Coordinates of C-alpha atoms and ligand atoms in Angstrom, one line a residue:
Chain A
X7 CA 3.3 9.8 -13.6
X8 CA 4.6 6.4 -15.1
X9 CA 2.4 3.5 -15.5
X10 CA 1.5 2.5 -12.2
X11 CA 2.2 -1.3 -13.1
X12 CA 1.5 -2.4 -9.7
X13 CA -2.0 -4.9 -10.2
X14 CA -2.1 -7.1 -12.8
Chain B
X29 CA 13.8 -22.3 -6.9
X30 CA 15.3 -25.2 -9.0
X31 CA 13.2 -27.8 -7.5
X32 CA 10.1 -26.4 -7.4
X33 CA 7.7 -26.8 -10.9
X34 CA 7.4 -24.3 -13.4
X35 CA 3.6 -24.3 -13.0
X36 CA 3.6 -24.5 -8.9
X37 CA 5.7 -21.2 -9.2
X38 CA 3.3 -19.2 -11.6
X39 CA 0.6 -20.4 -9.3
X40 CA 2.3 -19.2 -6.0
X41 CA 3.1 -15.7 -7.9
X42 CA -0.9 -15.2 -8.3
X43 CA -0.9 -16.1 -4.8
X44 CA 1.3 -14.1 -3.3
X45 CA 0.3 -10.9 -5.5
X46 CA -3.2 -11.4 -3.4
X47 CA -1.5 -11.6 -0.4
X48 CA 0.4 -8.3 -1.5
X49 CA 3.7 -10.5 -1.1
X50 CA 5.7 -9.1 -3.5
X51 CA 9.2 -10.1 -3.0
X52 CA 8.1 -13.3 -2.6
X53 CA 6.0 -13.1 -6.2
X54 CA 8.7 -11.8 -7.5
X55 CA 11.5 -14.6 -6.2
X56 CA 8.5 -17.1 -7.6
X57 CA 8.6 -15.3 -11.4
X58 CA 12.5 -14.9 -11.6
X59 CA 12.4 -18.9 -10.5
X60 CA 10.1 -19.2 -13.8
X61 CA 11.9 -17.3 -15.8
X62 CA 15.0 -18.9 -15.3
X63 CA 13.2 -22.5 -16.0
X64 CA 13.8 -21.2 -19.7
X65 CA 10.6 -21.2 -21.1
X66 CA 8.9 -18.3 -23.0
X67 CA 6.5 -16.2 -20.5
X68 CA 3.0 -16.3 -22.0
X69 CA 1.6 -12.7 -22.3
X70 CA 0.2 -13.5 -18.3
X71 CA 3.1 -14.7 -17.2
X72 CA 5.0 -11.5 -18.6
X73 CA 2.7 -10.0 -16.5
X74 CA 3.1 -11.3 -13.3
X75 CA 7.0 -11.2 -13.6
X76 CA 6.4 -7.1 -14.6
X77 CA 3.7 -6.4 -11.9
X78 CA 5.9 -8.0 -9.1
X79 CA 9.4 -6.3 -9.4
X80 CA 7.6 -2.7 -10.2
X81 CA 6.1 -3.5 -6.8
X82 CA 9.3 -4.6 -5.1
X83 CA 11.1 -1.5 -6.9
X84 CA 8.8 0.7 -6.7
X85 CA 8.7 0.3 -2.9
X86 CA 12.4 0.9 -2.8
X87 CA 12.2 4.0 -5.0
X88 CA 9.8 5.7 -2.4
X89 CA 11.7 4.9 0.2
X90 CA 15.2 5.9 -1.3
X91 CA 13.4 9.5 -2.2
X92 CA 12.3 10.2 1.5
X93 CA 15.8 9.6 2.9
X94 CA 17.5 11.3 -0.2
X95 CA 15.2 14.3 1.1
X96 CA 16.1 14.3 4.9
X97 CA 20.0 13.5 3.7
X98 CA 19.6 16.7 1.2
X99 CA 17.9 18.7 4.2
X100 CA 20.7 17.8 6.1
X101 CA 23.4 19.2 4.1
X102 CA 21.6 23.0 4.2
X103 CA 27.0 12.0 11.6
X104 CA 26.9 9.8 8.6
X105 CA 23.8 7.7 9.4
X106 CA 21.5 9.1 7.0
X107 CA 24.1 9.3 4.2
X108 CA 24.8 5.3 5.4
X109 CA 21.2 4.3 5.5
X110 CA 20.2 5.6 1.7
X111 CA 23.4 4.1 0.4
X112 CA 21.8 0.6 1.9
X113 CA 18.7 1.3 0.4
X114 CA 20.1 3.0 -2.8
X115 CA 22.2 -0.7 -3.0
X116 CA 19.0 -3.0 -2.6
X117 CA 17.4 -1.1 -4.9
X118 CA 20.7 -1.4 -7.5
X119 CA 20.9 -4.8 -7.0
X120 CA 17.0 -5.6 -8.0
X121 CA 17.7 -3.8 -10.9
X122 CA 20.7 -5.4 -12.4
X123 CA 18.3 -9.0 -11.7
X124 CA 15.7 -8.1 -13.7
X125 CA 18.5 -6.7 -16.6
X126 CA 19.8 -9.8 -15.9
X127 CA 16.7 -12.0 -16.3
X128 CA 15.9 -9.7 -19.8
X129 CA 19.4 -10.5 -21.1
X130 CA 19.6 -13.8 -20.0
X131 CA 17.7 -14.9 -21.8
X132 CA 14.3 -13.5 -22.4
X133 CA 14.9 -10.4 -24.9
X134 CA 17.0 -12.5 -27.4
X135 CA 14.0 -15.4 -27.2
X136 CA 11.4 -12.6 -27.9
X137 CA 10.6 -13.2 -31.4
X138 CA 7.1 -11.9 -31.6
X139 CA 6.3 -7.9 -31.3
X140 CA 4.2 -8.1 -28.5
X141 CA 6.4 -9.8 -26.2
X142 CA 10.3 -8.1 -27.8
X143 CA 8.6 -4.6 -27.0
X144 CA 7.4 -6.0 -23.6
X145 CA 10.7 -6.6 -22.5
X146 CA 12.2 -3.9 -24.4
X147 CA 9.9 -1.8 -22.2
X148 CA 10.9 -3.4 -19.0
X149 CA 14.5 -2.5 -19.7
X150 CA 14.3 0.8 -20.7
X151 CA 11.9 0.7 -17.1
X152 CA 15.1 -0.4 -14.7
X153 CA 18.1 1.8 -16.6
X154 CA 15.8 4.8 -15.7
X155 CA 15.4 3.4 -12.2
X156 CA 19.2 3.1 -12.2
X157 CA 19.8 6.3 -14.2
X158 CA 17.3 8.4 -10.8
X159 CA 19.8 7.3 -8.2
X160 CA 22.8 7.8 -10.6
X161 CA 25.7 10.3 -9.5
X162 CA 28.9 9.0 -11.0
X163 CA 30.7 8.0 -13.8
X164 CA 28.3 5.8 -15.6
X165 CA 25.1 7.9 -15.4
X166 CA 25.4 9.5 -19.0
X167 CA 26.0 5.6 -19.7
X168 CA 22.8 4.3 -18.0
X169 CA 20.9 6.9 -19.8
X170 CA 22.1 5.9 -23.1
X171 CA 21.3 2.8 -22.1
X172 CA 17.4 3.5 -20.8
X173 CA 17.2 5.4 -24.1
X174 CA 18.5 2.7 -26.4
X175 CA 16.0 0.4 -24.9
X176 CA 12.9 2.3 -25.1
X177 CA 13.9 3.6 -29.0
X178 CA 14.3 0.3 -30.1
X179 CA 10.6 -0.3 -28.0
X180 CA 9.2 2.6 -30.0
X181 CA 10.5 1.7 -33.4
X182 CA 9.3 -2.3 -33.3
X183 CA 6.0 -0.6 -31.9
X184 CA 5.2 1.5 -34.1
X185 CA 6.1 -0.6 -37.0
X186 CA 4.1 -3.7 -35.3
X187 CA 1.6 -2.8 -33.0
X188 CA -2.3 0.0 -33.6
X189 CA -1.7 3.1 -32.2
X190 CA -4.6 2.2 -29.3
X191 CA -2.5 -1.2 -28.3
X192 CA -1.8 -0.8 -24.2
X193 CA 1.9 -1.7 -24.2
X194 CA 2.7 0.8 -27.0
X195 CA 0.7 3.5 -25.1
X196 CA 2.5 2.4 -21.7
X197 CA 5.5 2.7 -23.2
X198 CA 5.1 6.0 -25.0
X199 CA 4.0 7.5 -21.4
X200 CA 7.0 5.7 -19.7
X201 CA 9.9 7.3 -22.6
X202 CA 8.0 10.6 -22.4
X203 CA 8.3 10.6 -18.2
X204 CA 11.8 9.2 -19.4
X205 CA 12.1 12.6 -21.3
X206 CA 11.0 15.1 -18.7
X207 CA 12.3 13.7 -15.6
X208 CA 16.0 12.0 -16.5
X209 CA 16.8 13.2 -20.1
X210 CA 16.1 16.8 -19.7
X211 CA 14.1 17.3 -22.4
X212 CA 10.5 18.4 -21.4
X213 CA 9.6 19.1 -24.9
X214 CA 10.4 16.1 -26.4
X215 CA 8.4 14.3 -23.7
X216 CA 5.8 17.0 -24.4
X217 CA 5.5 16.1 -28.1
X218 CA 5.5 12.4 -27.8
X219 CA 2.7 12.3 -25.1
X220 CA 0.6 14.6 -27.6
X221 CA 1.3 12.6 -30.7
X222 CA 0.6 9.2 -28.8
X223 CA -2.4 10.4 -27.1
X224 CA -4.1 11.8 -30.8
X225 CA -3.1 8.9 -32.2
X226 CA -4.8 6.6 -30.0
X227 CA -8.2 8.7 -30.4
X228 CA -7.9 8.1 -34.2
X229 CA -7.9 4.8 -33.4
X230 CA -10.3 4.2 -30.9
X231 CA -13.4 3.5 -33.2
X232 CA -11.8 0.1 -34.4
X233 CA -11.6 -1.4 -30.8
X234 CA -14.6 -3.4 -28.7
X235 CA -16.1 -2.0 -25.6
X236 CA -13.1 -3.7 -23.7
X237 CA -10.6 -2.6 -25.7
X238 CA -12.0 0.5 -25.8
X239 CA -11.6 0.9 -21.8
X240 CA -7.8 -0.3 -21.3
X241 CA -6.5 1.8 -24.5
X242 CA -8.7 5.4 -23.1
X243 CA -7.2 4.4 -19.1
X244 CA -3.6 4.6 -20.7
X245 CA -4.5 7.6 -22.9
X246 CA -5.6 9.1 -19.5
X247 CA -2.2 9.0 -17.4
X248 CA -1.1 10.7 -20.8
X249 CA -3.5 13.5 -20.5
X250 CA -2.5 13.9 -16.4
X251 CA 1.1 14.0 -17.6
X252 CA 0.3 17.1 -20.3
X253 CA -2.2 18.8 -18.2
X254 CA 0.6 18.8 -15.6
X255 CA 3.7 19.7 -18.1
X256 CA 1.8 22.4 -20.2
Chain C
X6 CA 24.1 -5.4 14.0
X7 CA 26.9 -6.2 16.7
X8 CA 29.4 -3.4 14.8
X9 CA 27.0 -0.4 14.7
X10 CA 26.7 2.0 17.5
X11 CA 23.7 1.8 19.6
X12 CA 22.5 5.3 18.8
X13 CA 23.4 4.9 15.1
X14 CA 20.6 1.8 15.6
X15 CA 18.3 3.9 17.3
X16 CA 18.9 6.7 15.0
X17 CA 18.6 4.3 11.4
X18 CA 15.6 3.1 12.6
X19 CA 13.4 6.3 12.7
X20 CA 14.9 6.9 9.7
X21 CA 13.5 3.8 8.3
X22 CA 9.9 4.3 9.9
X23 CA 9.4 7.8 7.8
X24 CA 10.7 5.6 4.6
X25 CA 8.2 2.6 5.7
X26 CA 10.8 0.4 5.8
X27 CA 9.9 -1.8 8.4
X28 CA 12.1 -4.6 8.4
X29 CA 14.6 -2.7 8.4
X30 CA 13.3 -0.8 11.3
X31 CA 12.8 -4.1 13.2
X32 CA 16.2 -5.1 12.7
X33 CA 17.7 -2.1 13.6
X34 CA 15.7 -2.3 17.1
X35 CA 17.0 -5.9 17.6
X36 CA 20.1 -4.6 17.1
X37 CA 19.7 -2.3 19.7
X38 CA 18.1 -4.3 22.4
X39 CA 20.5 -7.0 21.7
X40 CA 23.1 -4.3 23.1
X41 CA 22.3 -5.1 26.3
X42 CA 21.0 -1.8 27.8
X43 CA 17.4 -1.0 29.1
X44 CA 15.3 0.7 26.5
X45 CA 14.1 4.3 27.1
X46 CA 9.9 5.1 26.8
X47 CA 10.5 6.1 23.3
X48 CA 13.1 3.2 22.1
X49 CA 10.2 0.8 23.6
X50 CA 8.2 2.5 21.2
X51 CA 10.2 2.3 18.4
X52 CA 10.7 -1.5 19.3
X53 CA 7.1 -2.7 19.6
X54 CA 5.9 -0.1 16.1
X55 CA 8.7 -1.9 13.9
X56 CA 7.1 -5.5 15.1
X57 CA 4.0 -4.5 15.0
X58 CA 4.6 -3.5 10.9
X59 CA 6.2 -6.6 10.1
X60 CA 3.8 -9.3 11.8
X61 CA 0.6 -6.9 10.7
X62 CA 1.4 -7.6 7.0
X63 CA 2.6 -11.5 7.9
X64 CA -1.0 -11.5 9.6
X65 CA -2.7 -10.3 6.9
X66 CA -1.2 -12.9 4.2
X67 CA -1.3 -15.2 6.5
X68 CA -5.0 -14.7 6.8
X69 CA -5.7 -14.3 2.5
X70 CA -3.9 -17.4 1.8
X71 CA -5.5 -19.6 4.4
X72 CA -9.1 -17.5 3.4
X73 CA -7.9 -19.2 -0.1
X74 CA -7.2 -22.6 1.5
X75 CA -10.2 -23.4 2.9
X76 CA -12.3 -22.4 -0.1
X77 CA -10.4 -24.8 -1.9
X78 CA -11.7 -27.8 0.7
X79 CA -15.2 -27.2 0.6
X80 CA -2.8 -29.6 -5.7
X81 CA -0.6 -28.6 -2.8
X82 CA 0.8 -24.9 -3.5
X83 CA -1.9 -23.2 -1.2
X84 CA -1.1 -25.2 1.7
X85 CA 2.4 -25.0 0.7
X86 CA 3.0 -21.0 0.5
X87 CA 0.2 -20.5 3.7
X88 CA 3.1 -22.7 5.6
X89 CA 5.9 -20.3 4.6
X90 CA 4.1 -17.5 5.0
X91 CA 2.8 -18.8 8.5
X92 CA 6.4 -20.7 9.1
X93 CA 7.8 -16.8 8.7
X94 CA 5.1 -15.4 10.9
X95 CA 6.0 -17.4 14.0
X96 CA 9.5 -17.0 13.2
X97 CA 9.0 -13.1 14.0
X98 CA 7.3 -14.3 16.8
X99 CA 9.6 -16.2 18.1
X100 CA 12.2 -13.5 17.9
X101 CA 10.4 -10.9 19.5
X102 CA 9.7 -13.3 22.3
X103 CA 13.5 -14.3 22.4
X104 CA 13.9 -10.3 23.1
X105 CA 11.6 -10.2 25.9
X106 CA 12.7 -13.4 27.2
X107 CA 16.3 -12.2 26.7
X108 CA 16.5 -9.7 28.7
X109 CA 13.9 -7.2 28.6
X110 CA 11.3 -8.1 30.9
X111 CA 13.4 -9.3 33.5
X112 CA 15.4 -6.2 34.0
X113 CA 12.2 -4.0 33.7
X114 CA 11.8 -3.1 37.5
X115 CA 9.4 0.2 36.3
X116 CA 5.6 -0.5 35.9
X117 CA 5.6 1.4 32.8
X118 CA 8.6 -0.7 31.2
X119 CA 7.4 -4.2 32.6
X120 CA 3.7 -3.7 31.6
X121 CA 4.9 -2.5 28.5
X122 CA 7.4 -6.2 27.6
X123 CA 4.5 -8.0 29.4
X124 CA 1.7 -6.1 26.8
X125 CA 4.1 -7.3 24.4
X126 CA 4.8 -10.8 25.2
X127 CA 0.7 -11.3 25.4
X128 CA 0.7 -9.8 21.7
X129 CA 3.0 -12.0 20.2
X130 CA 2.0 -15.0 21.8
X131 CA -1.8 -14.2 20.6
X132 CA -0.6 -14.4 17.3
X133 CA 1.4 -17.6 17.4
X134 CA -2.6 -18.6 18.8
X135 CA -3.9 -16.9 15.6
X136 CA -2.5 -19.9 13.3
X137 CA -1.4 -22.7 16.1
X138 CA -3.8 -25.7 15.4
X139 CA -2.0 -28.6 16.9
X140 CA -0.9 -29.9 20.6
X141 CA 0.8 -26.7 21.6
X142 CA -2.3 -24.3 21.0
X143 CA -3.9 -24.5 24.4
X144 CA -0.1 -24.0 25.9
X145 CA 0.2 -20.9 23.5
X146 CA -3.0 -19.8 24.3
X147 CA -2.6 -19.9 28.3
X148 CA 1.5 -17.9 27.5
X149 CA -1.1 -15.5 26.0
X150 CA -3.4 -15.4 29.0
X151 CA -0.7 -15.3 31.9
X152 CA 1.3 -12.3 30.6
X153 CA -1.7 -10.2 29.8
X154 CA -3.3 -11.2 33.2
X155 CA 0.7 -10.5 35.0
X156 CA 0.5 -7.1 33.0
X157 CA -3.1 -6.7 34.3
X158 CA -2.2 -6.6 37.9
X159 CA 0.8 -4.8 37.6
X160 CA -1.2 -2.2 35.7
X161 CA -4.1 -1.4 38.1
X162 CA -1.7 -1.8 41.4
X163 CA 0.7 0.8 39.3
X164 CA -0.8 3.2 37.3
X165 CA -3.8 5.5 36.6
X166 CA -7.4 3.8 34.9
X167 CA -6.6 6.5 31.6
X168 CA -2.5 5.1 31.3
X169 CA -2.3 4.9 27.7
X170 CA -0.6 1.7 28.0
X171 CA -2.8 0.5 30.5
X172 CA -5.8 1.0 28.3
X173 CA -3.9 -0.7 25.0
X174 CA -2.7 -3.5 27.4
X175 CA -6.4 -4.1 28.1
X176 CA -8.3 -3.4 24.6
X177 CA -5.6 -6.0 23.5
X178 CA -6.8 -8.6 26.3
X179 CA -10.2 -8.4 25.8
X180 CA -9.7 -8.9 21.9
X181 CA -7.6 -11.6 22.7
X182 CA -11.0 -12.9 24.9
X183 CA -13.2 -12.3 22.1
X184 CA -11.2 -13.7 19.2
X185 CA -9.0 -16.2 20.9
X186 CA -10.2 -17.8 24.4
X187 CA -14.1 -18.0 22.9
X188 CA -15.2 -15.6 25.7
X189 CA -16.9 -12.7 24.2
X190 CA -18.5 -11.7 27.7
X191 CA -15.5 -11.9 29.6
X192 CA -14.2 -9.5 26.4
X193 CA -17.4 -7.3 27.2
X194 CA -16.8 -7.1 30.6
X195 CA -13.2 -6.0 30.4
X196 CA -14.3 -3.4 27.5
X197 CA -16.8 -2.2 29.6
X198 CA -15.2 -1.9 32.9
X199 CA -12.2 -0.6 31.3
X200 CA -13.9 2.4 29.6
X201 CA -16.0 3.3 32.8
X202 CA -13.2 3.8 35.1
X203 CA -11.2 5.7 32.3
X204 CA -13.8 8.0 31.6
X205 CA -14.5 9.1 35.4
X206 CA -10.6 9.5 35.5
X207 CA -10.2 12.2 32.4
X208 CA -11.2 15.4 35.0
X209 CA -7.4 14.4 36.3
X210 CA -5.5 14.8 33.0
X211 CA -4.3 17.9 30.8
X212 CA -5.3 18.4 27.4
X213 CA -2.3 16.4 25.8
X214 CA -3.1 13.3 28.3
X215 CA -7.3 14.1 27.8
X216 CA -6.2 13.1 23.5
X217 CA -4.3 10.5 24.4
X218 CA -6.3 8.3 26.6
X219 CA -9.8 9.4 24.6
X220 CA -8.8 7.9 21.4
X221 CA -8.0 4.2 23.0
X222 CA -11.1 4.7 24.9
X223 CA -12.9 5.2 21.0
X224 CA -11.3 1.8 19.9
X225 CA -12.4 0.2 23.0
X226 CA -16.1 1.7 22.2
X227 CA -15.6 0.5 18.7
X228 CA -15.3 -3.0 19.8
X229 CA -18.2 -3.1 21.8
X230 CA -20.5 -1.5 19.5
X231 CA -19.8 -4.3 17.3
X232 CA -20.0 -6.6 20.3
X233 CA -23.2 -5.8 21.7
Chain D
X19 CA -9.8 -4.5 16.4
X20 CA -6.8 -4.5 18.4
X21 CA -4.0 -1.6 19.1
X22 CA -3.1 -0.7 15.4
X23 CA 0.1 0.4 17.3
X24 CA 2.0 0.8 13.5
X25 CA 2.7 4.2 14.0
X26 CA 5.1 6.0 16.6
Ligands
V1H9 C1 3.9 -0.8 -19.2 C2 2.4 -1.3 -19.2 C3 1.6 -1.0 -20.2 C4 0.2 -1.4 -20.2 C5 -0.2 -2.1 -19.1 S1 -1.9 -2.7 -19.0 O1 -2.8 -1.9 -19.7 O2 -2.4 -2.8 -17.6 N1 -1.9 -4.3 -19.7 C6 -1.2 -5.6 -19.3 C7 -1.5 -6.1 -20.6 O3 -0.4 -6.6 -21.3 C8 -0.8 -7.1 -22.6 C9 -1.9 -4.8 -21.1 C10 0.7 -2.5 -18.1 C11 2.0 -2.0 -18.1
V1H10 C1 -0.3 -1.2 23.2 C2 -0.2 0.3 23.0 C3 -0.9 1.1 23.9 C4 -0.8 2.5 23.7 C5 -0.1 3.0 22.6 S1 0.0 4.8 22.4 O1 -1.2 5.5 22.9 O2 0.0 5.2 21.0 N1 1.4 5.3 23.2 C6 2.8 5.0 23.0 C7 3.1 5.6 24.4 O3 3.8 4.8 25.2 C8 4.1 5.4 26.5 C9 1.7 5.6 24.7 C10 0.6 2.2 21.8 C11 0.5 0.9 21.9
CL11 CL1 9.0 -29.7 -15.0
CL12 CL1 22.8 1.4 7.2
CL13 CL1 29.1 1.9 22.1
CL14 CL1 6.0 -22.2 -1.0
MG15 MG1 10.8 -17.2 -29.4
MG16 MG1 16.1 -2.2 35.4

């Protein structure tokens, strides 16, 4: 798993 | 969006990430960018949370059709349908490369933001590099590589070992290791060395800091319990 | 899509259901209506799913951004991007109703596939109501009405009270009571009457047909628990 | 709650 990144 | 204000476009981003709009956050932060200001850390953000979504949305859905087209090969329209798909998903990529080399890496003076975007590029070559068959993948990996060493070494020089971009980018090069570059080990020994790192560090950081470094160091932990 | 082949349509867009891409799906479907032939049960299917998707998540943008607007009236960008967002919405809308219009419904002679456009045509004209405000709401509003009630009479002259499509066609209406016309009896009474004639009509059905109609009878249950 | 109907 990468950094889901998705929400800031 | 030429004619639309910096400030009415950064506003419409937070907007639309509420309304789970993504493209349209994401057309809103590439109008910003390309205003020609510095992004604020925020702003960085915003522009980084929207195209992972856009991407990320295009990745999924490339992988389930490269699955039935793989299946299939145990008329042409599933081969026709993940090229289209593969080709959106292309053509996102080389905009944000764009957007970083034009001109936002180059403007990056401070640590914080140069390893940001640094990040971000190593981030789409190894989007590129997964759908890569041809000629230039060796190239795009080179390239993801390049960009994420050059992340490490300003980071490491710059940045505490508990500092979230440093730890998101370690985890992002190590997945870089194990899933593109073929080197499991390597992405073994860089998650281990960032993660006891960061717990070396962790009495120097508030209650706050505390939490977003230890979430990071987490997804490192998942990634090792999963690879070892 | 006037140069792909109507099954290559057909066939691209379950292809771009299990990827989630749904406007792709939506525009494969136009594509293949817009060939000119009658639609099978299943292409109906695929048609009215692939709509469904795209207006959902309009609706449900729609619905954050104006959530945002009015809390803001108790500068301009809210109203601004609720207009896109809403100007997009009934731009779908109007598309799908350009299909019906052109030709579905009028060369649907089968109960099934003219209940099924006329379902439809209430649908998308209930959400034009959804965010119409104006001179043209009540007009929108009685489109709504008139081909749920056509589809109504067709129904129970033409098929049997636990008709999956019969049951959707009226679960739909009476939400469209409740939330729309401001008649939360008449809502009720559909719900009610609706369930009670299904329910003494499951002895007739198989196993397969007894899952199918129960689980539009729960959501039509659903509704009037949090009715009554 | 209408037909959630996103699903074939
Ligand atoms: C690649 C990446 C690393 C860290 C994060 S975060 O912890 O959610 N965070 C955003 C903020 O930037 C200074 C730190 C997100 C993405
Ligand atoms: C509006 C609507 C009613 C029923 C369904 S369904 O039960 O999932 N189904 C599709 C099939 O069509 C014949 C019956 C879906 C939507
Ligand atoms: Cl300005
Ligand atoms: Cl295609
Ligand atoms: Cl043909
Ligand atoms: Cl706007
Ligand atoms: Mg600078
Ligand atoms: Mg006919």
């Amino acid at each position: 798993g990468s950094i889901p990144g998705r929400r800031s | 969006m030429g004619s639309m204000e910096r400030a009415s476009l950064i506003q419409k981003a937070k907007l639309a990430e509420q309304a789970e709009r993504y493209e349209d956050m994401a057309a809103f932060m590439k109008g910003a960018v390309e205003k020609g200001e510095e992004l604020s850390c925020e702003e960085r953000n915003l522009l980084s949370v929207a195209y992972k979504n856009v991407v990320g949305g295009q990745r999924a859905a490339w992988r389930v059709l490269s699955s039935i087209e793989q299946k299939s090969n145990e008329g042409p329209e599933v081969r026709e349908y993940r090229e289209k798909v593969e080709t959106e998903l292309q053509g996102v990529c080389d905009t944000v490369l764009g957007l970083l080399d034009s001109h936002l890496i180059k403007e990056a003076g401070d640590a914080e933001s140069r390893v940001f975007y640094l990040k971000m590029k190593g981030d789409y070559y190894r989007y590129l590099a997964e759908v890569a068959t041809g000629d230039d993948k060796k190239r795009i990996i080179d390239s993801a590589r390049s960009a994420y060493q050059e992340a490490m070494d300003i980071s490491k020089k710059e940045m505490p070992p508990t500092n979230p971009i440093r730890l998101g980018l370690a985890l992002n090069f190590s997945v870089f290791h194990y899933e593109i570059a073929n080197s499991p080990e390597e992405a073994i020994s860089l998650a281990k060395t960032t993660f006891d790192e960061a717990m070396a560090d962790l009495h120097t950081l508030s209650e706050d800091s505390y939490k977003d470094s230890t979430l990071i160091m987490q997804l490192l932990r998942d990634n090792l319990t999963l690879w070892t």
